[PDB]
Subunit: 193 residues, 6 copies
């Protein structure tokens, strides 16, 4: 996808942010957005095309792929990026609003509360997506999925495309997410002390 | 698609708009346009390719897919974006026209009536697309579609691609649309008081 | 496709044009070019791939698709955009030529005749494409096409991809075209009075 | 394809050219490059994929498609664009060279001979591609191609994809090419008188 | 993929780097990123599509492709690029931080230790990816892969797409990687003496 | 592929180069890069997809395509472009280095030796790729390839996609390469005298 606009806004955000925040935005751009576009989207491109079920039943592969993958991992990661970035956009907008207010007439007062809330929201959204992915997929895609959804007769064996590569990238993104959490914790403590 | 031109115009619009309007345009860019390009368009890419009907009848899958999905959701969302953005373009053009008039020789007088009408039109178009989608698709795509359109013999069972992911994104976009409504209401009240 | 160059030229044209002309160019960019790229091109992407004929005859689907759709609607719309935009380019070039002439040494004299001719040509090309599409396709694509072109034996039944969505967009573009006509009429009268 | 670089150079060329030359470059950009990218490339995309021959012989469709279309029309048009544009690049380079010479220390002297040669070369390359296409394809693609190339047994019937649309665009490009010839003739005469 | 953002950051890095470092970044951009986008991604595009196993067993090709290629080479190279570039980003950020510090109030002191650590990390990540690829794939892809992973019955013969071209590019990238190592060694020694 | 970065560097190179060198870079951009992107990449897109072998043997088409085309022509041309451009990058970097040296404190002295070496390297790499392609493919792709590589039983007949178009472009690129050689020879002599 085209992340250009979000890029513009977040680049603006870098200036009005802590050094650790600039590190966080670098991580977001490089290890999350760029990995997803350059590497992961191609991994998941044949997810349903090369999903195969051992059966002659029409409609079984469709319902089985749908039950195994209610949302694709890459779409989940898109949404995670958007939601962890939204607080930064809120804070940046409040900052620009105060600048416009000054013109009509760095981090302190209302902006400090807003920045702390921004880090907080980023952390909660962060953790939330991590836990949701754990409960939806664990952290390993196995090659076999056994499916008993109508119209499949009895239980059918279905086979995943590229499960090991997908597992590698699942874990890569989990690690990047954990690094982001650590960075946000560092921001909180660094402001505190 | 390439939303660059609309982006230029709407970016211009941000300056000559209320803070809540800038929030609204941020939502439009991020949670509607970017989600559609980065996430949803891939979800709906195999909508007819992986639509399967249990029959040997030539032409049954075509007519059944057409009856189940007279317009694709993603195309509906494109049109919604365009029509909710058009009023903002009208107001921005009127503003630029007044600026040119001044050169030949912020929100008050004629521009205030135009801005209120802009919010109104945005709200009516907003609600209209919501209700139309409800009446066309509800808010859940089921995996089975039963089709009795000629040439299909008797009633045939047809199966949808990715119904659960599509439902997730249908609801995501409904929520984003409702948030937009709330923002427009806030604009009206904020101008009133 | 990449409409960037035409965009540059037409953007230049906006400055040296009436307010109604700027509205017309906004309509062209948004409701014609952007709709075609973002929405319609995907609708028509599987036009021959998912065109199906009930027969075992080799070559029947090819000749039948060709007879049903001698030109694709989207290609027709491309050509319409180009030809309705060419007069504006002519006028803009004449304007720039007069500017260069001044440097060597707004709408009046020769430029006024050229601007009226520009509106006229735009209107005639407009109407011409509308009428031609009426006579080639009407304004509704039906799901069944009956084809008797060699080598098809006797008359064969062939089935269209996405006829209802295509009809929706056919009518959308017809409406946009009619709105353009109205705008050009307004330009003529507004200059007259 | 990405014509950006050629675009930059030719845009430079516009300034150092006659008004008719600026018209010619507008035609090149709009009615040749943009049509090819936006419209024609999609028409010819399925040229071999949907080329069908009535036979069971392995390799017959490949050799028959190759004999019917030794070069694709769209590739021919690419090459035509490049070769008709090269003289303009030569002249522009000579102009820039004279400018650099002046700095070290409009159309007259050596530049006039170079400009006339540029128009001449453009005209000869123009006519040459026209005539070559006539002798290779005529100006109408018929739906049936009869092929007797080994390994096809005896003569086989093969069927073209989208012959009528292809014919429409063949003739469109022929007309654009003829218009270019007329413009070059006008340049020659306009300089003469 | 779109490497634009990483490009911006690394371009910034060039200024605040040694001549050998500018050579290294030129190599990264040209012989690694550009080769991957322009050449290698097309080579590996049909890696699973044209992976063929001699069997009638459903699911055997999927599990066999997955066992032969747990990660694709091109994805490995993406990750290598990112990780060898991250140290340069760290150093550049520290440099910009010192510049901001100066404003609030070339290579020496803390920046020298950071630059040496940057070269070190680049070298260790470099070597690590080389060795890992050796242990995962060696440096030659053979055309035959023999697979005994469930559900494949007994041992099945599977056949690789484009093994010789893939081997050529594997070795090309190994050579480019070794050249990068040499450049980093030269940086270390050049700073030392 | 995206040649933007190489384009930036080479554009820089134009300024610090001879007139014949600017011609050479124009040829590189237009007749090599642009032809490859706009025309040739589409010609070679179906090279394995539409490669057909007369056999029932699993794996025979894969090994036969691999033996006939160990590297694709278009990938060869990519690599040729990169390697003939690298010397120009070296010289440009040395030039920029001398400029930075001057700031700390056109073609003559060390730069003259470097420029001559640049032309030399360009010429040797040029000739080398030409000769290698001759020895790998000759200069004509025939439609029939006879393949006896295991697992193909005895000798099988395989058929090439688009051999005549491919031959046309092979010869086009050979001619462009020879023109480049001539230009480099002219540079050497022009500096000599
Ligand atoms: C279905 C339980 O059935 P199952 O266990 O048999 O499916 C097994 C898992 N299989 C469906 C993927 C195969 O129900 C579920 O698992 C629902 C899991 C919900 C996962 C996360 C929802 C919240 C995400 C919040 C993100 C935003 C935070 C800011
Ligand atoms: C900044 C954050 C950094 C995070 C980095 C996280 C990287 C995680 C890499 C590997 C995850 C485990 C893969 C796995 O769990 O594989 C299981 C599979 C055996 O599973 P089974 O089917 O036999 O039961 O392993 C096998 O034996 C088959 C061979 C698999 C080898 C895969 C090597 C991947 C190397 C990637 C290096 C990335 C460097 C950045
Ligand atoms: C067809 C009623 O047949 P059915 O209920 O059996 O089809 C069931 C629904 N299925 C056709 C999708 C399967 O007729 C309809 O539903 C027509 C529904 C019309 C939906 C919205 C039209 C207005 C949208 C306005 C947007 C612009 C506002 C500014
Ligand atoms: C700013 C606006 C924010 C709006 C956010 C709206 C997000 C809506 C997310 C989920 C919608 C309900 C999905 C559903 O209705 O699923 C039904 C299906 C059981 O239906 P059935 O076939 O058994 O009958 O559920 C199952 O059990 C299968 C497992 C489905 C788990 C799907 C988890 C999706 C998590 C997305 C998180 C997004 C975070 C932003
Ligand atoms: C064929 C009449 O046979 P049919 O009625 O059986 O074909 C039925 C229509 N079906 C061929 C699409 C199936 O002949 C025709 O219809 C020719 C119709 C010509 C349509 C428009 C040509 C002029 C467009 C001008 C645009 C430029 C203006 C500035
Ligand atoms: C600025 C210019 C604005 C121009 C807007 C023009 C929009 C035209 C929208 C609908 C055109 C009629 C569609 C139709 O003619 O459908 C026929 C079909 C019954 O035909 P049959 O096969 O039963 O015989 O209708 C059915 O019952 C099946 C359900 C079809 C519902 C389609 C709803 C489309 C809503 C689009 C809203 C666009 C908002 C901008
Ligand atoms: C083959 C004559 O056999 P045929 O008539 O049976 O093929 C019938 C035509 N079919 C091969 C396309 C089916 O030989 C030919 O036609 C050769 C025709 C040559 C056409 C143009 C070559 C010069 C283009 C110059 C462009 C550059 C100028 C600046
Ligand atoms: C600035 C330069 C402008 C150049 C414009 C050139 C445009 C050329 C348009 C049409 C060329 C003739 C098409 C043809 O030769 O068609 C033959 C076919 C009967 O051939 P047959 O198989 O029966 O034997 O005609 C039929 O009856 C089937 C219906 C075909 C109708 C096609 C209408 C195309 C309208 C395009 C309008 C473009 C406007 C710019
Ligand atoms: C699987 C050993 O089974 P196998 O030999 O039969 O598989 C044969 C190789 N085949 C799986 C590719 C077919 O286990 C392995 O080979 C694991 C190999 C691990 C390779 C590299 C992991 C570390 C990469 C670090 C990169 C980051 C450094 C900064
Ligand atoms: C700056 C760093 C520069 C690094 C450059 C590294 C380039 C490596 C090129 C070739 C690697 C060996 C290919 C090979 O190992 O091929 C094995 C195959 C016989 O293997 P077999 O199946 O008979 O057992 O060779 C055959 O006989 C079949 C014919 C293969 C000819 C391939 C020629 C490739 C030419 C590429 C030139 C690149 C120039 C930059
Ligand atoms: C700094 C540059 C270092 C360049 C080092 C190049 C080393 C080339 C070694 C080629 C060994 C071929 C062995 C051979 O022949 O065993 C194959 C059989 O015999 C045959 O098929 C005859 C094959 C004949 C190949 C002739 C290759 C000439 C390469 C000249 C490169 C000049 C660069 C300036
Ligand atoms: C294989 C000889 O077997 P064959 O003749 O039966 O293959 C016939 C040719 N077929 C493999 C393409 C079918 O071995 C070869 O031809 C090796 C040919 C090597 C070609 C060029 C290698 C050096 C390129 C240098 C580029 C970089 C310079 C700066
Ligand atoms: C600045 C550098 C300029 C370099 C320009 C190089 C252009 C080379 C063009 C043609 C190369 C020969 C094609 C050929 O060798 O074709 C063989 C084939 C008979 O071979 P066969 O299978 O019968 O045995 O010829 C036939 O008869 C079938 C008809 C083939 C006609 C192809 C015409 C191509 C026209 C391209 C014009 C490009 C203009 C720039």
């Amino acid at each position: 996808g085209d992340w250009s606009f979000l890029g513009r806004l977040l680049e603006n955000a870098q200036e009005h942010s802590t050094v650790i925040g600039k590190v966080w935005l670098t991580v977001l751009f490089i290890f999350r957005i760029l990995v997803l576009g350059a590497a992961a989207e191609e991994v998941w491109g044949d997810e349903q095309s090369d999903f195969t079920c051992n059966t002659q039943q029409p409609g079984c592969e469709n319902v089985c792929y749908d039950r195994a993958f209610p949302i694709s991992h890459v779409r989940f990661w898109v949404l995670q990026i958007i939601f962890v970035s939204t607080p930064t956009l809120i804070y940046l907008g409040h900052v620009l609003h105060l600048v416009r207010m000054e013109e009509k007439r760095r981090i302190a007062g209302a902006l400090l509360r807003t920045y702390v809330f921004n880090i907080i929201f980023k952390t909660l959204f962060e953790v939330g997506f991590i836990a949701g992915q754990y409960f939806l997929y664990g952290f390993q895609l196995k090659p076999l999925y056994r499916c008993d959804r109508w119209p499949c007769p009895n239980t059918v064996d279905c086979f995943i495309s590229r499960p090991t590569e997908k597992t590698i990238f699942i874990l890569f993104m989990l690690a990047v997410a954990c690094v982001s959490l650590l960075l946000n914790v560092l921001e909180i403590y660094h402001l505190g002390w």
